[model samples]
Target: AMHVAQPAVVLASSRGIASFVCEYASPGKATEVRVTVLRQADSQVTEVCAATYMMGNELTFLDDSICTGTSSGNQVNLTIQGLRAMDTGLYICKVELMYPPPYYLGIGNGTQIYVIDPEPCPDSDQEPK
Candidate 1:
């Protein structure tokens, strides 16, 4: 049997860069690691990006448009570039670990991205004394 840790909370601003980190510690050696990032907006759910790390140090990306991923040590980071306001939504990280005989599938607790906007001017509509 294997266990996986939860995902970390990330804070990001609009039109900025953001990353979701998934960390795991397994009892057995990992033969294959699969990480996927999903976004839930409104009534639709879409996959932002995914990566599979196999033996011989092979890495492949499912989508290489707006998102990218990196795996190092026991952590995998999903980086989102040029974030927009509409990008705010529920983010989920799904991790699959292959440990020979017993395979394990773990999902992160999930992360919420809140985009902040600039405040409006206070005296923009004010009249001259």
Candidate 2:
């Protein structure tokens, strides 16, 4: 039996750094890992990045500048820098295993990340309601 899991939710502000870890419990070894995002604002399916058991083989896409991932044992840790409101979304980690049958796939429970604008209204002249 195998299982994939991630954080329940992640909340961070703009320009802040967000961290996540995808963990898998499997009898068979893990072959590959892919991270995908479901942007909350648009509900679009976007591929964030991908990594394999082989070192230095990462398909980070354009996220190379703002995001990074490193695999450690049975888990892959990821970090997102300079977060923005547009970064809020549901992130899922898909893990591919070497074993056959149902153990072939490990789809994580997913992590819901919310990026908030920490800064208040810029113009103090406009008071609150």
Candidate 3:
């Protein structure tokens, strides 16, 4: 018998921010990676703002709400981009594996996106004494 497990991909979005990460115990490798945009938002889990495809192993922050991947040793990073208020929902990751039945497996904890505005500063007790 052979172990047939799919490659796991984990993703989360919160506060107009989205992030994706992967973890493996065994000695494995990946050739390609991608993010899947869900149609509807899950009541329990949040949605994603924006997703990207990583070419390498390292993660690179291109701009606000934009991220890229690089080949840094054996680590892989997937960044989010162009975050927005409506971009709050559940996000999923899919990785290309070398071998296994379930080629892609969901990895990491699902993220939640909540948008909150900042409060203004308060005045001093003795104003213009």
> Which candidate number has the best TM-score?
1
> Candidate 2's residue-wise lDDT over 6-83, tens digit each?
888877656666778878765655445444433333545656655454334654546534566667777777666776
Worst 10 residues of 1 by lDDT: 120-129
Per-prediction CA RMSD (Å)? 4.8, 4.4, 8.6
Best by lDDT: 1
- In model 2, what lDDT does residue 74 have? 73
TM-score against native, each model? 0.72, 0.66, 0.39
Give a tens-digit lDDT track for model 1, residues 1-129.
245554446677555567767776656556588777788778888777766655446456646557767777777777766656777667787777743556666777667766555445555355422
- Minimal lDDT window, size 10, model 2: 32-41
Candidate 3 — which residues are off by over 4 angstroms?
1-17, 25-27, 33-75, 98-109, 119-129
Relative to the unseen true structure, what is the Cα RMSD of model 2? 4.4
Put down candidate 3 lDDT per residue, 47-128, tens digits, no spaces.
3323333444333233333444333333334455545656644444333342444565444333343443333445444442
Quality of model 3 by C-alpha lDDT: 0.39
Better of 2 and 3 by TM-score: 2
Model 3: weakest 10-residue lDDT segment is 1-10
lDDT of every model, 2 decimals: 0.66, 0.61, 0.39
| lDDT at 95, model 2 | 65
